[PDB]
Each structure stands twice: as C-alpha cells, then as structure tokens.
Amino acid sequence: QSGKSLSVKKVMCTASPEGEAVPSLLDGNGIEFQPLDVVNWKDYPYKPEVSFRIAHTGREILLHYKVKEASVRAVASGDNGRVWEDACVEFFVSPEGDDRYYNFECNCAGRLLIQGGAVNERRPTASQEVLGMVKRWSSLAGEPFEERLGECSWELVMVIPVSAFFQHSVGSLDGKTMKGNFYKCGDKLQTPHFLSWSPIGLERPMFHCPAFFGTLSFE
Template identity: 55%
Template sequence: MARKDHRKEGMTLLRKKQKLSFWVNLICLLGLHAEAQQLPKKLIVDKLDLHLADPSMIPRVFDETHLEYHQISNVNWPDYPYRPDVKFRIAYSDFGILLHFKVVEQSVRAKTSLDNGPVWEDSCVEFFIQPDSSNDLYYNLEFNCIGKLLIESGTPGNRTFAGPNVLANVKRWSSLGTQPFEERKGPVNWELAAVIPYSTFFKHTIERLDGKVVKANFYKCGDKLAVPHFISWSPIALQEPQFHAPSFFGYLQFGYD
C-alpha cells in the first residue's frame, strides 16, 4: 500500500489557501476602489487677498499663487464614453469666486451668441453651486467656449433665469475670443476664466464665504458636438445624463477651519 505524502498535501493546501486569500483581497480592493469612485469629491478653496476685476488676469494670478488644478474626468454614462481633458482651478476673495478652466478636446463649437442661450449644445463648461445648506436652491452657471453664459437658480425642474444685470456682472475671458463659429475639428486647446461676484447668487444675500462648506459640482459637456459627452468632477449615479442632480454634488470648503 502506497504511503501518502502528507507534506506534499500540506503544501498544496497552503497554496490553495494563499490563492483564495489573494482573490478575496483583490475583490475587496476592487470593491473599495469602486466605492471610492462613487464618493462625492471634496476640495478646499483658497482665499486670495485681492480684488480682481479682469478675468484675463486669473490664469497668471493662479500660476503665481500655485493653485492646484482639479480634473473633471468622471464618465458617468457608458453610452457617452468620450472624455476630453478638462481641469479647473478655483479661488475666492472678499468680492466673489474666481474660476479658470482648461480644456483639450477633439472638436470645438460655439454657435450660441447670446447669454441665457443654449450654451450646453456648444463646447461648454459648467459650475453648479448650492450656497446655503438650509434650503435646496442651487445655481447653474454654464459657459460656452466663447464666454456666453447661462445662469439659473431654483430646484430641479423649477428654474429661474438670471436677469441681464446679473449676467453682465459676471466678467468672462476666453482664449477663443467672443465671436460664434461652427464646429471646428481639432484637437483644440482652450481656456475660460470668470470673476463671479457674490451678487450673482440673486436669490441669496452672500457677503462672504470664509469658513463655509457648500455643495457644488463642475461639468464639461457638448450636446451637439460630433461626439457628445457629459463628464463631471464629482460622480453621478443616475441612469441617464443629468447634471441637475444636487444629491450628487461634491463639497467645497472655503478657507481653512
């Protein structure tokens, strides 16, 4: 009768346990990674001690103060997989919020020539913000690549357009100028900067943001480009493309505690 090699059997069992442990750990790590991908984003917004009225100066000022870029890179809907290279920087002052977007995409379009027009159909960057957690009102600021701007306030499905004075007070600069054009095939690089005074938030009275934590999200879209796309800074877990989703906003902390 043949003798069993218990040492060999033990080694085989150990290898099986090691393999099982490896796969269990890998599955756990993948699960944690997937969960992390769905967590709302958070960032600290630095304060700048200046009154900047000219938006074309924002990129240089941000460079000099070494402000960090943040990627808008969440592809939330598999039917729209294209992801242009989009990043933004944000700061604030005693007078308002300062924004700078940088975009590289395979084509660019700017047919909307008026404020409060359908800028989302063009190459468009967007900033949504809920400045007061005590109510559900939020604002959407949507800029096409030549600086035409749409502003609304309210709740999902119940929006109010900003008036001409509010729009005029948001100063904008675009590296592509201000004249509309048909879609241009790329690749194309462009930048947009904006000075957003606190009066922009016309359903609120905001004098300062120091120490506040507010909900917000940043987007890039192009509904009528040759390759439509819908990407976000903070992820959105909905079935269809929808940016008016405050339950999926991330968080901005203005200044340090």
C-alpha cells in the same frame, strides 16, 4: 458613497480681478489643478482631457478651466442661449445648504447661461444686470462660430461675485462650506460627451442633481 471634497484657497485682492488676469493670479498663489474626468455613463465614453481650479477673494469665486478636445463650437448668439450644445464648461453650486442651487454654463466663446432655484420649480434664468456681474474670459472668445473640427486646446475663466447668487443675500465667502459640481459637455458637437468632477449615479446624463454635488470648503 459620498461625493468628493475641495479646499478653495483664499487669494488677497483689493479690487475685483478681470478674467484675462486670473490665470496669472492663480499661478502666483500656487492654486493647483483638479481633474474633471468622471465618465458616469458608458453610453458616452469620450473623455476629452479637462482640468479646473478654484479660489476666492472673499467677495468673489475665481474659476479657471483648461480643455483639450477633438472639436469646438459656439453658435449661441447671446447670454442665456443654448450653450450646453456648444463646447461648454459648467459650474453648479448651492451656497446656503438649502434646496436652491445655481448653474453657471459658459460656452468656449464666452456666452454664459445662469439659472437659479430648487429642482421642484421652474428655475428662472438670470437678468442682464446679474449676467453683467460675472466677468469672463476665454482663449476662443469673440464672435459666435460654427463647429471647427480638429484637436483644439482652450481655456476659460469665470469671476463670480457673491451678488450673482441672485436669489440669496450671500455676504462673504470666508470660511463658508458650499456644495457643487463641475461639468464638461457639448450636445451638438461631433462627439457629444458628459464629464463631471464628483460622480453621479443616475441611470443617464443628468446634471441638475444636488444629491450628487461634492463639498467646497472655502478658506
């Protein structure tokens, strides 16, 4: 019972960091990796080795995922595409303790999907302006590509400004407590799979479940 908990350590930056620079920034501040290895459904037993880490600047959330899996894919031609089908890492979060939440899904090539809203309504997709706010970087960034079979190690970064919570007026992350979860998947990969950070007790693979989110304590 209860979900997991995380301390999101603060990092001191005068300006907004670029995605490529984040791994160095995080190693510089000793930000540790957390395993993302909860296999909630025995139907999909494949557990590719995945870890992540998180920190904040006060104005922005910094995420860094590391993955090692049997295949990768990035067909999605644009942002707000069908990224969950490609090799994809995800971050879901509710920032104000209300029922509205956000899902940031990003494929291994850097294409990103963002939606916002409560479970009981159509959760609209984000605008170009808002997609433009979220800086990204990947080790497999660039052109879209058909599935490549073979063991592949990749990394991905998301710099999520506080303004990207497009349905809220979130000012500063300093000392806030949010609820969220982190996921790995790839619906159209050779071996589809479903992994989470904090556990989920629904009968089958479902990620849009605020009840099962863990706790995120921003320093």
